[PDB]
């Protein structure tokens, strides 16, 4: 049997979306609970996750959870979207959320490492610090060249959690420069938008379409819900 | 030869030591090529690892490999010490470099996540940027508190690649503040050194001792060679 999975989450961040993708790809059974910035004050820092009150957060095991309850002592609390991706691959081995070959598992984890050390820093300096679009586009060149040039997904022919880790990021990057919502340099957003639609990113376009076609994306991507919450998160930042 | 392991390594840096600990714990057959961290052989970048020319770098498969040779095209090349650790737990499932339970595996990964996002940057601010010693001790307090208080290793009663990830940092940090070899603020190295010997850090002294008592330390930790290359690296960097 499958012990109980309750995911604490939100829509603006790419990070809960990563977890949902894997959960869907494993045809897992789970419930979701949403979490606001007022939830993290009133009850989610006091009652559920005191250390850092971050989502995403998996509760594995124990009984049915509703909002404002504390997780049972005996259930496991698992933060950190990448660890959770690894946990799901361990929990659902029949789903091959990671390939079986040790070298191709490394290749998946090297892909993710680079999303984290290279793609995310570039996005931050570009969308949040007004950096120039050259830097952003060169990070995207590099990401694209790490894709298998002979086609398929990040680690090769089979979908893996390396795809779950980057795809939420690319979708929101595209949205944020399509809506021009960000702390961009002047005209930076439409430079990046037009380049992502051009031949320089053919391989990446194809990779995005290959991921968006799988039933797991339709099941985890709600344009409006993400947009709504993405715009909001930008205004929070903006204020302060 | 379908299983040959060649490791590009060095002594001063913690990251190749992580891999050696794992190889010894797995009773793996392997060969080492020594890349100098004081005067890096430029054939390493030109013929072996052009992108980043960093150690550790693990060559899996193919024929015998000598210094000043390119690895075979048909062999796998794996950088990133934490990826290599996971790679070796997958190569050697019977060694149990990770526990079998998914929650305990997540526990190990979480522990490592914390070494990476809290301990290393604290060490960096401290050893490289001359930051105050109490900030460094605070990251050490937190590390110690994440250990099982009764005894045992990072993730439980069994050794795991999470001990392989943190033990080389701990050893070199001790050595570094004991010889005051670093860009420390006046009097900050002795504060940390004396606090590491005091009853505040007794649980952590235990952890280091328990790890050092395992055969894998004697087989991987040559303190005189580490110190020679660590001092030589530091003096070179200072002169610049
Ligand atoms: O999921 C991660 C991310 C974590 C990490 C997080 C932040 C950081 O700066 C570095 C590493 O390292 C790991 C180490 C592992 O053995 C397995 C893992 O799944 C991870
Ligand atoms: O070893 C790592 C570290 C890498 C990482 C590097 C920098 C960073 O900020 C976060 C993660 O992420 C991972 C993700 C995985 O699924 C498995 C892994 O072994 C790793």
Numbering used by the authors:
A (entry chain B), B (entry chain A): 3 to 242
Q: What sentences appear in the manuscript?
A:
To further explore this issue, we have conducted biochemical and crystallographic studies on the interactions of six GSTOs from T. versicolor with chemical libraries.
In order to determine the structure of a complex between TvGSTO6S and a flavonoid, several candidate molecules were chosen for soaking experiments. Two naringenin molecules bind in the pocket described above, which constitutes the L-site of TvGSTO6S. Each naringenin aromatic ring stacks with its symmetrical equivalent in an energetically-favored association (−13.64 kcal/mol calculated by DFT). In TvGSTO6S, the naringenin pair fits the apolar environment formed by the neighboring aliphatic part of the side chains of both monomers (L84, V85, R111, T115, E118 and T119) while a hydrogen bond with E88 stabilizes one of the flavonoid hydroxyl groups. For the first time in GSTs, one structure revealed a symmetrical ligandin site (L-site) filled with a pair of interacting ligands.
